[PDB]
Design a protein around this ligand. Structure first.
Ligand SMILES: Nc1nc2c(ncn2[C@@H]2O[C@H](COP(=O)(O)OP(=O)(O)CP(=O)(O)O)[C@@H](O)[C@H]2O)c(=O)[nH]1
Lengths: 176, 23, 132, 426, 37
RNA sequence: GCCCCUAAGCGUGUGCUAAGUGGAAAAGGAUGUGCAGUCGCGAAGACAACCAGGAGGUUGGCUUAGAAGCAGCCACCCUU
């Protein structure tokens, strides 16, 4: 509970509502609603922050309490500032283009591979070889980022494919 | 050896007290 | 920048000059004459506090040969040892370890400022051949 | 591991073809194999017969003559070379009533003694199956020793039973399926080699393989050349698996050196599966080296012995007379002077003498200059201001100083094919 | 992925864990990626 | 034996168990209990985040394709 017991600061624009066990939050960048599990009590402090407490200190409570408490903080950070994952492509002839809502890659396949943006996720491209995903639900943002990343299999020889913004992929050598 | 192994290990029961005929 | 302690006694050593023979198109030959304008009558034992410039115009300072023994530039040997406290083929005393130019008798980190005279017990007798 | 008791011994030379000297060589070879199994030679006789006796091998008269010395010696080790048929083993055992040795079983059980790796001992067990399956139902300590193959008239008329197949055929099917599984078991060491098979081989790491007669010094040479620690002993078959190590040259390209299992003569031919480890090395090698000790037996008979199998295997395999270098090394302290005749018969004398002499510069040359080759004579001239232009040339390839007295001159180095093909870029 | 009854850290950068009720050695070096089975 | 099949007890109290263990086994691993010790920890700031620290003779020699902090090779036993 080192940061489990630390309150969840709520920036000004945030609009939190505790309908008992569940939790909804409207923010500048959107809305997000979750449900902290039962052996936890969540509520709102007089100074706007969110307080998450547990009944006891067994393993399950001592894990789940911290989980939910910091997860709600992630949600608030998402609704306020949102999560953006920047990703660079590599390889001679590997490019990305934005077909409006959808993102199309040319990862050396005999077809261009088109990913349709999930509900609540926006794609941007700073260049045909550098793009980024954006959203409010960090889970969904990271999940689609991972789908884009695993589009192309690892290429530890020339490193052709998609990578996160700052990443040190495993590179090996073939002298032949 | 499953058949013999089970027939033997079923002597370790509350009713048999760890002994049965033919082990 | 560039930093390297060359122990040759000459001013044209192969490992450094090769990539530094005519590097820095702006100062291919400008750098040559810049660091060979003066000190030429001197002996280029180490010749390397050169920090970095866009024009290669600065002051030199021969810090010291290996802290193991500062007789590399005096007698002229170019060898040492490898084993800890192996032997001592080179004699030396406080004859020249009093001033040893204006070096940085400090630590790499912002640690402390005790060095230089540490040749007796400090970081000089790693290979053994030192003050006798 | 199918051993046998030797301790004391007396030898006999069968000499059913060739010269008395060659028969003596064969006798001493089998006596050395006996020592390898652990023994102490006493004395060796000789005889002179035509085609072996189909039943007694050595004949009734010589069988009794040898039984006389057997009963005098009071031990069971009397040595006689040859390959004995099951019938011959039966007759000899009935005559002598003790244990006499044959070359095939001696070689096989010494392989069993010396084996240390799983593959080696699997191969030696396969050789055991190959040798013993003929010695079935007929030989001395046979399965059907008046006690086996019992199940005969199980169907007088007919009734509620019967095994079916012929008894001897089923009993042989036991070993036949055993060895069928063992032959299926053959492991591809090519997967271990592939690190250097396609790569390296083609990527220039050539392949020098030391092959020669047993005790000659193959492993000793490997150790001397490659700083290794490979097993060195006077015993026969000191080396079991054809190990390998590195060793470089003035032209670099680490010559992956490989030792092998030595040859002697007229090998059993059933443990060719065991020898495949070294046969494959010879077939895939681009420089064969024979090793001949200074004071080695005979002027040249071991060389013909090895070369017989070399020619057989390589001719069956491919179009090849793989580079063979019959170097004469390890000659110092040979304690002999009649070596000028051999030197003139084949000019070579390059002493390493178990590192005592260490005069292997001529060898290190030959090994190399024989079949070394690359894209030598490339002039990689470069300004020397970029740093990139010196990249990889002095690291992957190997420079030879040449005109490169400075960086602003003609720079050439013997480099790999892939490294530079047009990369001089004047 | 080395599936063995006995999985241990091969090098100091390996890490033993339990995912889904199974002991796994996860490492930066993927040769050392082992699983208990 | 006692949840229903199958007659009381889906008994009472305190714990353990997350595998259906229970309801089969020789095992590598520790992340469930309680232990009992133990370095430093005291809220005389501990494991931790944000945390300026990046050329001391610092290519230190070994030695040289460079041997730069860094293929390697035992060392560097030092301070406001
Ligand atoms: N005195 C002397 N002995 C030698 C020489 N060469 C080899 N030997 C003897 O041979 C023994 C090692 O044999 P080894 O090098 O294994 O021969 P090999 O060709 O590998 C035969 P195997 O493969 O069956 O081991 C040593 O004990 C050594 O005494 C030599 O030049 N001089």
């Amino acid at each position: 509970s080192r940061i489990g017991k630390q309150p969840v600061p709520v920036p000004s624009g945030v609009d939190v509502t505790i309908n008992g066990q569940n939790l909804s939050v409207k923010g500048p960048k959107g809305t997000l609603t979750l449900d902290v599990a039962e052996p936890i009590s969540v509520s709102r402090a007089e100074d706007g922050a969110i307080v998450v407490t547990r009944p006891d200190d067994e393993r399950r409570s001592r894990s789940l309490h911290g989980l939910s408490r910091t997860l709600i903080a992630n949600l608030v950070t998402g609704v306020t500032e949102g999560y953006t994952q920047k990703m660079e492509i590599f390889g001679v002839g590997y490019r990305v283009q934005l077909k409006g809502q959808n993102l199309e890659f040319a990862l050396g396949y005999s077809h261009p591979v088109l990913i349709e943006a999930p509900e609540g996720i926006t794609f941007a491209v700073e260049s045909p070889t550098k793009f980024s995903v954006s959203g409010i639900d960090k889970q969904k943002v990271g999940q689609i980022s991972a789908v884009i990343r695993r589009l192309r299999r690892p290429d530890p020889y020339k490193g052709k494919g998609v990578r996160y913004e700052g990443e040190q992929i495993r590179r090996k050598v073939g002298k032949t | 050896a499953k058949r013999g192994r089970k027939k033997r290990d079923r002597k370790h029961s509350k009713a048999n007290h760890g002994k049965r005929p033919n082990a | 920048l560039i930093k390297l302690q060359i122990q040759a006694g000459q001013a044209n050593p192969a490992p450094p000059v090769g990539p530094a023979l005519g590097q820095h198109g702006v100062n291919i030959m400008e750098f040559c004459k810049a660091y060979n304008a003066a000190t030429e009558s001197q002996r280029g034992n180490v010749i390397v506090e050169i920090t970095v410039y866009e024009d290669r115009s600065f002051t030199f300072a021969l810090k010291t040969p290996p802290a193991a023994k500062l007789l590399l530039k005096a007698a002229g040997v170019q060898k040492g040892s490898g084993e800890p406290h192996k032997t001592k083929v080179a004699k030396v005393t406080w004859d020249q370890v009093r001033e040893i130019a204006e070096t940085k008798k400090a630590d790499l980190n912002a640690n402390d400022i005790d060095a230089a005279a540490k040749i007796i017990a400090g970081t000089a007798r790693s290979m053994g051949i030192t003050v006798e | 591991y199918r051993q046998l008791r030797l301790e004391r011994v007396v030898l006999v030379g069968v000499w059913t073809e060739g010269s008395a000297a060659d028969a003596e060589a064969s006798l001493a070879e089998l006596a050395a194999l006996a020592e390898t199994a652990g023994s102490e030679v006493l004395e060796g006789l000789i005889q002179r017969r035509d085609k072996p006796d189909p039943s007694t091998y050595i004949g009734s008269g010589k069988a009794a003559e040898l039984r006389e010395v057997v009963l005098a010696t009071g031990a069971d080790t009397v040595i006689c070379d040859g390959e004995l048929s099951p019938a011959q083993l039966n007759a000899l055992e009935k005559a002598v009533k003790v244990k006499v040795i044959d070359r095939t079983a001696l070689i096989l059980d010494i392989f069993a003694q010396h084996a240390t790796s799983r593959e080696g001992k699997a191969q030696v067990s396969l050789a055991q199956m190959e040798y013993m399956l003929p010695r079935l139902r007929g030989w001395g300590e046979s399965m059907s020793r008046q006690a086996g193959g019992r199940a005969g008239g199980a169907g007088g008329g007919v009734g509620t039973r019967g095994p079916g197949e012929t008894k001897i055929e089923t009993d042989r099917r036991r070993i036949r399926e055993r060895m069928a599984k063992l032959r299926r078991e053959i492991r591809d060491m090519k997967k271990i080699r592939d690190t250097q098979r396609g790569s390296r081989r083609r990527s220039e790491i050539p392949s020098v393989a030391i092959v020669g007669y047993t005790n000659a010094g193959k492993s000793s040479l490997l150790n001397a050349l490659t700083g290794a620690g490979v097993l060195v002993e006077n015993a026969l078959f000191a080396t079991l698996e054809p190990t390998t190590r590195r060793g470089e040259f003035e032209d670099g390209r680490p010559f992956v050196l490989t030792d092998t299992v030595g040859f002697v003569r007229h090998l059993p031919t059933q443990l060719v599966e065991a020898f495949r480890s070294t046969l494959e090395e010879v077939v895939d090698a681009d420089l064969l080296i024979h090793v001949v000790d200074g004071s080695d037996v005979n002027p040249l008979a071991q060389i013909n012995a090895v070369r017989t199998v070399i020619n057989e295997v390589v001719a069956e395999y491919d179009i090849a007379p793989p580079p063979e270098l019959l170097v004469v090394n390890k000659i110092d302290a040979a304690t002999g002077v009649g070596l000028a005749q051999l030197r003139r018969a084949l000019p070579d004398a390059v002493f390493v003498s178990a590192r005592t002499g260490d005069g292997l510069d001529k060898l290190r040359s030959r090994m190399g200059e024989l079949v070394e080759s690359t894209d030598a004579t490339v002039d990689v001239t470069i300004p020397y201001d970029r740093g990139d232009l010196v990249a990889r040339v002095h690291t992957d390839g190997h420079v030879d100083a040449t005109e490169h007295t400075d960086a602003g001159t003609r720079i050439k180095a013997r480099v790999p094919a892939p490294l530079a093909a047009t990369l001089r870029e004047y | 992925m080395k599936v063995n009854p006995s999985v241990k850290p091969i090098c100091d950068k390996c890490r033993v864990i339990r995912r889904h009720g199974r002991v796994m050695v996860i490492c930066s070096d993927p040769r050392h990626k082992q699983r208990q089975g």
